Design a binder for these strands. Structure first.
Ligand SMILES: Nc1nc2c(ncn2[C@H]2C[C@H](O)[C@@H](COP(=O)(O)OP(=O)(O)OP(=O)(O)O)O2)c(=O)[nH]1
Ligand SMILES: [Ca+2]
Ligand SMILES: [Ca+2]
Ligand SMILES: [Ca+2]
Ligand SMILES: [Ca+2]
Ligand SMILES: [Ca+2]
Length: 901
DNA sequence: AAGTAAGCAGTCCGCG
DNA sequence: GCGGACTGCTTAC
């Protein structure tokens, strides 16, 4: 097999590499890598190396990496560009793997671990590590085993061994319900003392040294805790055995609020699953406890135990250990679904970076572009410092607030990356500038044509047309991968809808789910067998389809994020190819494109309706348009349609056969106007939206920019079994809005769009009457809590103190004295509730850590003093008033003449 | 980490 | 009470 790296490090003048050799074995080597860098040289000097602008360079081979780094410094002293890849490990990887890496994940040791630390005096700080580690569960992907290290004797209590027999039993048998499918995979090791446990853990670690190291909060908790505990007991040399090269750095993570310590383990790639989830999931959660996320992702119930965690080991060691094991398994289950480790490996190996570098789009693109240029013997420019400067972004149309009955939406496929490719925007393709007219003059095609030679953006920039830049070349490659996975995702989605339909008529039989590939549209034969399946088999198939869709979603949306990150990186001062001329060329072209096409669509539709000056485009944001289809439906007449699906078909056909070709003609003209390299503006239909045929539903409404709701029947070619709401920006979509309130607001919107005013009024009346019964957590607001200290003045709110910060201070006074009450963590999220006048907490609100029940000593008082009136007005009535006034609808029945009977 | 546009909650204080 | 200037937070792209 082809060799591939596992990890790479620079340690002084050596590269330390762990890799998989041609026989599939893991090896480690130390290489005295001699790096090269480059200087510009005279034209007369024959060379094969040129910079991205075609200027000749001479290669400088250094005796070692320190000599190279020192040369960079002196070149700065002289004031001359030191060219080439200054991150020597990236150059090493490029030299050593000069081919597209094919990796075999089965050979990569992925370790998932979690530790337990009993602490009677509050949160056990990892920098101090003053308490024994009393449990470690460490799952190894190569062994497929959960290794459990269990401390039986501690100053905080001596306990009996954990029983695998009890662990397996149902909770109704007094057991722990450790999943039957992992029971046989547990290797249990009890220990008489902590020193023995830790020495054995280190020997185990030496034998089975993680390449990828993950778990939940491992970077901020488990890793530094383990490192520091071993350090305290045994000394530094022993703690450094966590690194395969015995090298560690105590690194600081800091922005503007504070600072925390992480331990860099050289020769390991730490991918903390909480950080993976935050970067790759495209959710924003009210809480990031593993309990919370596991429930959301897997629909598993929280791990329930009596009493505080600080007393769980002594009261119920059995459950304490079982929950440690289950916690490790839950992360594996989340990854089986989301496939973020697979994603990281794919992207890391593609770019030829340390795998942990996938968290940095800048590093990722730097490596991609370097490898691409190196292929042509081209030499990358030196990174420079730039002052941060603001620059313009997208255009967003101001909508008229209203209901909108029939709506069709369109938007550009991968807008910013397509603009880069179309215009040929790249550091080395800049050809010059032209005299810019106001943007509206381009939008209306009255400005002079910018260039008869070069490809232009309306910001004044011109680009070469003879050859693609490296940015367009490399962005195209990742775009094509994105396109492939999105195809699989959408096929799985369509397949899901087929199954949902068949579930209306399940057969009474005993049968099996079909063995199919959900990434491909079901054939006619498959569809026929589906119509004969039992509900049990159909539900299992639906589960499998939806898992396939999620896998496709992960693969596609993160590749989209990477390519959109390249467009953004051009406006990031840390990027090697930072250039506000290019960043603004993209965004300004985007503004033109949207407004140009708005004009064209209006012109087209006014022509097919025989009107003049009518605005068919009601809204647009960045690269999208929303077209009112009322007049199209009305031209045939509502009564001519058999059912909802009939007019949906008709609008789909109209969009595809009339609108899209007209859109395409408009964009081809724009391409010629800007003299662009290649027409790549592909604005395809997104949504077909409207009320159910014959109903009083309003179909949709806008309240303002980035705030709307549509009742959708078809989304990018997926025809839903049941209509689905597309809601953007409204409170139903915000993590800050109480859970029960999102739900209730969503139902109000459903009723408005699908059923109408009377239905809305009926629901509102019920919600208002019943809502006081809702669980306090379900009606609490949520906020991030930054800068708690700044606004704290002797335990009381300082000037300008934000409402949620006020609530935290209230909480802090109420739990003062307690070492054991949960502390609010700076930068984490809190639940927030308003408090009625004259409450014993002495302020108008209280906040506590999100994802948790408020501590028992104050819980009863919070419940008693919760201000339900304020909560309802602020989170429910105020937003609902906004939705209904925009939609010209009343949520409460107004008096009428009929009342007099 | 370090793409911009833009919405709403809340504080502070003016607005005769 | 609403509105602007402002901070804070959170979305839509
Ligand atoms: N830097 C950055 N830019 C973004 C992000 N989301 C959207 N944009 C910019 C770049 C996009 O091309 C543009 C249009 O946004 P869309 O959400 O419609 O995405 P795009 O058109 O790229 O992909 P699509 O094919 O519509 O799924 O807005 C983001 O998360 N980061
Ligand atoms: Ca735990
Ligand atoms: Ca788009
Ligand atoms: Ca599309
Ligand atoms: Ca059937
Ligand atoms: Ca869009």
């Amino acid at each position: 097999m082809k060799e591939f790296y596992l990890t790479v490090e620079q340690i002084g003048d050596s590269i330390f590499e762990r890799y998989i050799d041609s026989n599939g074995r893991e090896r480690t080597r130390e290489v005295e890598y001699k790096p090269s860098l480059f200087a510009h040289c005279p034209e007369s000097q024959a060379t094969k190396y040129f910079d991205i602008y075609g200027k000749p360079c001479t290669r400088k081979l250094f005796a070692n990496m320190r000599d190279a780094s020192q040369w960079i410094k002196r070149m700065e002293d002289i004031g001359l560009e030191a060219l080439g890849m200054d991150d020597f490990k990236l150059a090493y990887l490029s030299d050593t793997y000069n081919y597209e890496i094919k990796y075999d994940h089965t050979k990569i040791r992925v370790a998932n671990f979690d530790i337990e630390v009993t602490s009677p005096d509050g949160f056990p700080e990892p920098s101090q590590a003053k308490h024994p580690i009393d449990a470690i569960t460490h799952y190894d992907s190569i062994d497929d085993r959960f290794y459990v290290f269990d401390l039986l004797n501690s100053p905080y209590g001596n306990v009996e061994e954990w029983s695998i027999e009890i662990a397996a039993k149902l909770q109704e048998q007094g057991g722990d319900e450790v999943p039957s499918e992992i029971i046989d995979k547990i290797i249990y090791m009890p220990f008489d003392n902590e020193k023995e446990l830790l020495m054995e853990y280190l020997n185990f670690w030496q034998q089975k040294t993680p390449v990828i190291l993950t778990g939940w909060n491992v970077e901020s908790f488990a890793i530094p805790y383990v490192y520091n505990r071993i350090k305290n007991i045994f000394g530094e040399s022993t703690a450094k055995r966590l690194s395969p090269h015995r090298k560690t750095r105590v690194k600081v993570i800091e922005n503007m609020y504070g600072s925390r310590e992480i331990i860099t383990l050289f020769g390991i790639s730490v991918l903390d699953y909480i950080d993976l989830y935050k970067k790759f999931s495209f959710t924003n959660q009210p809480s990031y406890s593993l309990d919370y996320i596991s429930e959301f992702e897997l629909n598993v119930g929280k791990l329930k135990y009596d009493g505080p965690i600080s007393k769980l080991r002594e009261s119920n060691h059995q459950r304490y250990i079982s929950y440690n094991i289950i916690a490790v398994y839950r992360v594996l289950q989340i990854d089986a679904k989301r496939q973020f480790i697979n994603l990281s490996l794919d992207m890391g190996y593609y770019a030829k970076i340390q795998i942990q570098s996938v968290f940095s789009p800048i590093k990722t693109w730097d490596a991609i572009i370097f490898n691409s240029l190196k292929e042509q013997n081209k030499v990358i420019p030196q990174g420079r410092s730039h002052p941060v400067q603001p620059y313009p972004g997208a255009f967003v149309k101001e909508p008229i607030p209203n209901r909108y009955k029939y709506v069709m939406s369109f938007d550009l496929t991968s807008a910013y990356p397509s603009i880069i490719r179309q215009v040929n925007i790249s550091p080395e393709t800049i050809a010059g500038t032209f005299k810019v007219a106001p943007l509206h003059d381009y939008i209306n095609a009255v400005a002079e044509r910018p260039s008869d030679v070069y490809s232009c953006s309306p910001n004044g920039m011109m680009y070469y047309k003879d050859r693609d830049g490296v940015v367009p070349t490399e962005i195209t490659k990742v775009f094509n991968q994105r396109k492939e996975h999105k195809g699989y995702m959408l096929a799985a989605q369509r397949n899901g809808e087929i199954i949902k339909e068949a579930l209306h008529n399940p057969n009474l039989s005993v049968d099996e789910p079909l063995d199919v590939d959900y990434r491909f549209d079901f054939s006619d034969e498959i569809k026929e067998k589906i119509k004969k399946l039992s509900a049990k088999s159909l539900n299992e198939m639906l589960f499998r389809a939806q898992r396939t869709e999620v896998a496709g979603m992960t693969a596609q949306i993160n590749r989209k994020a990477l390519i959109n990150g390249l467009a953004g990186a051009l406006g990031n001062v840390w990027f090697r190819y930072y250039d506000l001329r290019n960043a603004t060329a993209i965004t300004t072209f985007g503004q033109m494109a949207l407004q140009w096409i708005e004009r064209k669509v209006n012109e087209y539709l006014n022509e097919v309706c025989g009107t003049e000056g009518e605005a068919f485009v009601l809204y647009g944001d960045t690269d999208s348009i929303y077209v009112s289809a009322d007049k199209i439906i009305d031209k045939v007449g509502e009564s001519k349609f058999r059912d909802t699906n009939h007019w949906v078909d008709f609008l789909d056909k109209f969009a595809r056969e009339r609108m899209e070709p007209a859109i395409d003609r408009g964009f081809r003209e724009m391409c010629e106007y800007m003299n662009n390299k290649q027409h790549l503006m592909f604005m395809d239909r997104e949504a077909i939206a409207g009320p159910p045929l014959g109903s009083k539903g309003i179909g949709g409404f806008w309240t303002g920019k980035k705030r709307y709701a549509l009742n959708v029947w078809d989304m990018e070619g997926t025809r839903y079994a049941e209509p689905k709401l597309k809601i953007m920006g409204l409170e139903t979509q915000k993590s800050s809005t109480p859970k029960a309130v999102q739900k209730a607001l969503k139902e109000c919107i459903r009723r408005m769009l699908q059923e109408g005013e009377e239905s809305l009024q009926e629901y509102f009346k019920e919600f208002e009457k019943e809502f006081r019964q809702l669980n306090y957590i379900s009606i609490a607001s949520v906020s991030s809590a930054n800068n708690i200290a700044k606004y704290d003045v002797g335990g009381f709110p300082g000037p300008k103190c934000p409402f949620h910060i006020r609530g935290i201070l209230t909480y802090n006074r109420a739990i003062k004295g307690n070492i054991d009450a949960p502390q609010v963590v700076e930068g984490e999220k809190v639940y927030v509730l308003p408090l009625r006048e004259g409450n014993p907490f002495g302020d108008k609100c209280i906040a506590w850590p999100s994802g948790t029940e408020i501590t028992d000593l104050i819980k009863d008082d919070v419940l008693h003093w919760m201000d339900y009136t304020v909560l309802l007005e602020k989170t429910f009535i105020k937003p609902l008033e906004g939705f209904t006034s925009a939609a010209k609808l009343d949520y409460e029945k107004k008096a009428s003449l009929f009342d007099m009977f």
